[PDB]
């Protein structure tokens, strides 16, 4: 389980991965049946396969960006909660997104939940 400061390595390598877009390294970074729900709000999705498609229709188009906002907020229980600003392209124009990412780490390292806070209100096209 992650101490503090390990939660916060850990989350900051996963927008580093998204970043440059490691959709493998993103995928290892999950426990096998984790869940994610991005945006908050929308049924999950369950573990590394459906993970997987999800980073690969999201990154796959070639040229997003990601980078902290601010600094990861950790616990002492192996969570953590970070901001985070994403840009895109939809319409051949930028578009970013403002989101806040909270993940629950499991005893072995890897993401076991994580949920991303956004939704129109955090989106400029």
Sequence with gaps: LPTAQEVQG???RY???VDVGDIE???QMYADDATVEDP???PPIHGREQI???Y???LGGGKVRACLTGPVRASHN???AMPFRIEMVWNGQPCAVDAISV???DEHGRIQTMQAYWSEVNLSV
Excluded: D, S, T
Aim: contains cysteine; proline residues 0%.
């Design 25 to 27: 390294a993103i995928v």
């Design 78 to 80: 192996g969570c953590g």
């Design 15 to 17: 927008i580093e991965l």
């Design 40 to 42: 908050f709000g929308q």
């Design 52 to 54: 997987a498609a999800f």
């Design 56 to 58: 690969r229709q999201g």
């Design 10 to 12: 850990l989350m900051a």
């Design 103 to 105: 993940m629950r780490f």
